[PDB]
């Protein structure tokens with residue numbers, strides 16, 4: 001009458017809903033399959049999501065390198081934070097929230113780049129194999145195959 | 155119903171022979187998982203980018219633009235990347251290629267709808283493909299050169315990783 | 329009438345070869361006491377978490393995010409060294425994903441209340457890689473086999489990390505018997 | 507030739523102390539009525555047939571390579587990095603440390619993953635009616651109508667003989683310390 | 688397993704004893720591995 | 730600090746309690762030979778006493794003039810782990826137990842013989858119910874707002890007034 005873990009509320013005497021929507025087959029790139037309003041997968045389907053992700057990735061690039069770049073006498077550029085940008089007409093609030101308030105990379109010590117990971121925030125790759133081989137190693141490298149071989153030869 | 159390229163394997167069902175370069179070559183059945191339009195758009199983009207990168211490696215061995223030698227020094231191939239990241243060149247390149255790739259994303263989704271051929275940006279300002287036959291020959295040549303340049307630029311950059319020469323210096327020096 | 333995996337035992341009822349990975353292996357009679365839909369959903373969830381977990385236990389040793397807090401090659405050290413607010417964010421986000429992906433039907437009395445809800449079918453196909461009809465059963469078999477293999481591998485990797493105090497690959501390269 | 511009932515097929519038993527099982531169909535090349543442990547009753551015959559063929563061809567290439575490398579014949583410049591000795595085990599380790607056998611492993615594994623796995627899977631699933639060991643490889647054109655056997659049967663018999671020969675040669679090199687010939 | 692023996696095992700005193708022993712064993716093992724927890728550490 | 734109490738890591742009477750406990754165990758330790766199992770057991774008890782007093786002294790607990798930790802339970806966040814957070818843990822577990830018991834009672838009402846379900850538990854269904862209890866506050870509140878928790882006063886038996 002009521003199989004364990006069946007998940008049907010009527011078998012457990014639980015208040016059900018009755019209205020159970022059909023499952024449509026339409027799919028969204030960064031969304032989920034499921035019941036939606038009419039017009040939804042045509043206005044916010046995979047095309048809209050991919051376009052908005054593309055536009056967000058494009059607009060990330062000036063946002064990642066956000067700052068006041070000022071040319072010097074030698075033609076070099078000095079980057080200084082938008083937190084030092086002062087405004088004339090808001091009373092005692094000379095410093096105001098800027099785009100760097102919403103994206104505070106330097107507060108966390110994160111060297112952001114237009115491709116997210118920057119020079120001083122580079123992804124660290126190191127080879128775990130320690131420059132030795134799978135078998136027949138003489139030195140500071142004693143692998144599992146070497147352990148098998150030494151166990152057999154004793 | 156067997157593959158022409160690999161005669162002991164079946165012809166993949168998503169492959170039909172319509173696309174340029176179709177020889178029934180998909181032994182691992184990648185076209186059964188992904189869309190063939192997405193796959194052809196990806197193949198054309200990888201191939202065109204690799205053709206440009208191969209020609210770039212050859213010409214950057216051959217010569218450099220005025221003033222690049224001062225900023226770069228005696229650095230070739232991927233070794234310039236980091237330097238030109240500290241300089242503003244690669245950021246500007248990424249900005250404008252990202253701007254192009256936004257409309258590339260819209261074009262890819264249009265292709266996935268089925269309103270646009272994969273890799274068809276209708277960019278023929280010199281009207282090279284007047285005849286449909288010339289169009290077919292240029293399509294086959296484009297896909298073949300793109301695949302060849304994919305292999306070529308892979309070889310060039312990994313040979314640079316081994317010797318630090320450059321594709322044309324390595325030929326003239328072992 | 330006998331189980332194919334275990335030939336000296338009778339074939340378990342409610343196992344009839346319909347599901348992927350069904351070889352008639354249920355000697356303890358879990359499917360005779362609990363519903364197969366919940367068991368399959370749980371098996372797929374444990375397997376998918378273990379796929380991600382085994383892949384992490386191998387990859388995090390080789391590849392790290394920048395920073396001191398992400399520099400632990402051994403995964404049990406990376407559990408403690410990683411920033412705590414980030415891991416609490418991971419917990420909260422997993423909770424929200426579990427809440428919304430099951431569409432507020434999370435329990436043993438209301439998940440599968442909708443007759444269209446299929447075990448392990450959360451509706452997740454971001455790139456629509458399932459658009460092939462004869463591919464489907466082989467795909468589900470490959471997914472459940474990867475999940476079972478990942479469960480066994482990750483269980484072993486955690487307890488061998490406890491025994492050896494070494495990350496898995498560098499334990500295989502610097503092996504010390506007990 | 508195909509010699510059904512003399513060299514292959516039903517009714518042929520080369521070792522009559524173990525009777526030929528009823529499970530063997532006689533269609534497979536090399537069927538000479540030898541299955542004492544009754545594996546043919548439960549295994550998939552196409553898979554184990556392809557496995558026998560692959561083990562055999564690998565052992566044939568292994569015998570040819572082992573003999574040509576233990577007698578002393580070498581490619582030009584190949585002695586220098588790989589050692590001027592004749593011992594096959596040290597040749598394996600030297601070519602591993604040089605990287606030669608890594609390249610061999612990479613390319614053989616690439617071939618095996620790219621076409622070998624799909625050929626085995628489509629043969630077993632029943633999508634191509636491909637026979638075991640059939641990779642469609644006849645560049646020089648030696649079997650067209652003589653393909654039934656006197657090509658297949660001699661291939662499997664030489665494969666099995668090469669398997670036994672390579673196993674014997676390896677363990678003799680281990681116990682003696684000297685390569686064959 | 689006999690269904691009547693399982694039904695006997697499902698009776699209130701047996702399940703009560705098993706569940707309370709299981710709970711007691713949790714409290715005992717938690718206090719064995721983490722003793723003297725007068726407070727939640729914060 | 731709070732209510733005139735001092736932190737336990739600087740209270741001299743806390744140290745006196747620790748010293749007295751360690752000395753009381755050490756005078757028992759003195760009568761046994763080194764390496765004997767009573768000696769190892771007593772030394773383990775000494776180690777546990779030292780670790781407990783160290784942990785209590787480094788936890789921000791307040792000690793009174795008696796020398797024992799005193800808990801603050803007025804709601805202040807500097808002592809939220811002494812009553813408030815154990816209270817939240819209890820309330821979660823207790824609401825779990827109440828919710829799964831109520832769910833099993835309402836299931837048993839639907840059976841052929843409800844009282845048999847009360848004395849002979851349907852173990853798979855009960856295990857399903859005890860699994861359901863992890864989201865008991867939201868489930869109980871939705872049960873309340875849908876009119877499925879509270880029953881009206883005209884449907885409950887009452888004595889003559």
Ligand code: CLA
Nearest residue numbers: 077219238240241242243244245246247248249250251252
């Ligand atoms: C009209 C749009 C536009 C604008 C306003 C800029 C603006 C700038 N670019 Mg830029 N760029 C653009 C389009 C544009 N770019 C495109 C489409 C590309 C190719 C994807 C690039 C690639 C690029 C690189 C690689 C570099 C810049 C740099 C710069 C900066 C130079 C500042 C300076 O003092 O140089 C003043 C210079 C001049 C007044 C003379 C420059 C004349 C050049 C040599 C002519 C080049 C012709 C070229 C071959 C034609 C392009 C066709 C191509 C699409 C095939 C400046 C912010 C540089 C930078 O960031 O340095 C800090 C840098 O290294 N850009």
Ligand code: CLA
Nearest residue numbers: 380381383384387388391392393398399400406407410429
């Ligand atoms: C079971 C999964 C799991 C868990 C719990 C962890 C846990 C951790 N990882 Mg790890 N990781 C995993 C899988 C996992 N990993 C996988 C599969 C990869 C390969 C892509 C990595 C690669 C990785 C790197 C490179 C690093 C860590 C690091 C860390 C630590 C800090 C957190 C962080 O920065 O994450 C970073 C996480 C990622 C880069 C990728 C996580 C993506 C996961 C699998 C989520 C994808 C599924 C998601 C839930 C969507 C499904 C929804 C759908 C079902 C509805 C932490 C201990 C850092 C560390 O301490 O170094 C040792 C670090 O530097 N992880």
Ligand code: CLA
Nearest residue numbers: 826827828829830831832833834850851854855856858859
């Ligand atoms: C299903 C379990 C359940 C639930 C939800 C309630 C709910 C309630 N009881 Mg009640 N009660 C129960 C069982 C339960 N009771 C049992 C078994 C007894 C006999 C010992 C009592 C004896 C009792 C008294 C004497 C009083 C309450 C009171 C109350 C109310 C306040 C909460 C309270 O004081 O809890 C405290 C509850 C207890 C001390 C007894 C609980 C005994 C166990 C721990 C609970 C049963 C768990 C059960 C085995 C779960 C099986 C489920 C499984 C099969 C899936 C509330 C309406 C009080 C009231 O009227 O307040 C307005 C009150 O004065 N109850």
Ligand SMILES: CC1=C(C#C/C(C)=C/C=C/C(C)=C/C=C/C=C(C)/C=C/C=C(\C)C#CC2=C(C)C[C@@H](O)CC2(C)C)C(C)(C)C[C@H](O)C1
Nearest residue numbers: 205206208209277278279280281302303306309310321324
């Ligand atoms: C269509 C469009 C336009 C067009 C356009 C575009 C600009 C077309 C121009 C295209 C060029 C970029 C095609 C590039 C081909 C590169 C080859 C295949 C790579 C070869 C590598 C191999 C041989 C190798 C390598 C080797 C190894 C690995 C390592 C080295 O040590 C040695 C070596 C180098 C030998 C135009 C303007 C006409 C207008 C038209 O209306 C519309």
Ligand SMILES: CC1=C(C#C\C(C)=C/C=C/C(C)=C/C=C/C=C(C)/C=C/C=C(\C)C#CC2=C(C)C[C@@H](O)CC2(C)C)C(C)(C)C[C@H](O)C1
Nearest residue numbers: 379380382383453454455456457474477478481484485496
């Ligand atoms: C659904 C699909 C999605 C996809 C997705 C996801 C990302 C797919 C990825 C699935 C990945 C995570 C598969 C992971 C497999 C790991 C398992 C098989 C193995 C562990 C090995 C064991 C045997 C071991 C270990 C061993 C241990 C015990 C002892 C050691 O001494 C040795 C050793 C280490 C060898 C995407 C996003 C593409 C979108 C698409 O629209 C829909």
